[PDB]
Ligand binder design. Structure first.
Ligand SMILES: O=c1cc(N2CCOCC2)oc2c(-c3ccc4c(c3)OCCO4)cccc12
Ligand code: NA
Length: 111
């Protein structure tokens, strides 16, 4: 059921935030600070910002009703990176590596 599947989602989230993946997960830890990064068009291009700290707060607050809602947010965060940047940027390479971790473990969710 949704609560058990959400436990698996919480496990995935913990893994994505763990030292194991820190070499490529770090960009996704906190909301993009567009002003600090000089990305003055970021919020014109990205209508729905997302990041792992926001996903974690939503999980902790029981905001996600099912695993599909959680996965849509995680995928939104990666898609924003693919949308904003040229495909050969290092931040996109990091997004792709972290998304592989996410998708392969999400595919192991119990029914
Ligand atoms: O979509 C993104 C676009 C960019 N950009 C900055 C780099 O150049 C390309 C444009 O950063 C993102 C970051 C990020 C966050 C903090 C950083 C960082 C990058 O880089 C070093 C300094 O701390 C995180 C998630 C998505 C993006
Ligand atoms: Na989805």
């Amino acid at each position: 059921g949704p609560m058990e599947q959400l436990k698996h989602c919480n496990g995935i989230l913990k893994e994505l935030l763990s030292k194991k993946h820190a070499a490529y997960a770090w960009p996704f830890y906190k909301p993009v600070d567009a002003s600090a990064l000089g990305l003055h068009d970021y919020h014109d291009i990205i209508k729905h910002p997302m990041d792992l700290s926001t996903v974690k707060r939503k999980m902790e607050n029981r905001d996600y009703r099912d695993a599909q809602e959680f996965a849509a947010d995680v995928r939104l965060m990666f898609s924003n990176c693919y949308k904003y940047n040229p495909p050969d940027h290092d931040v996109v390479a990091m997004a792709r590596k972290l998304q592989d971790v996410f998708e392969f473990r999400y595919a192991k969710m119990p029914d």
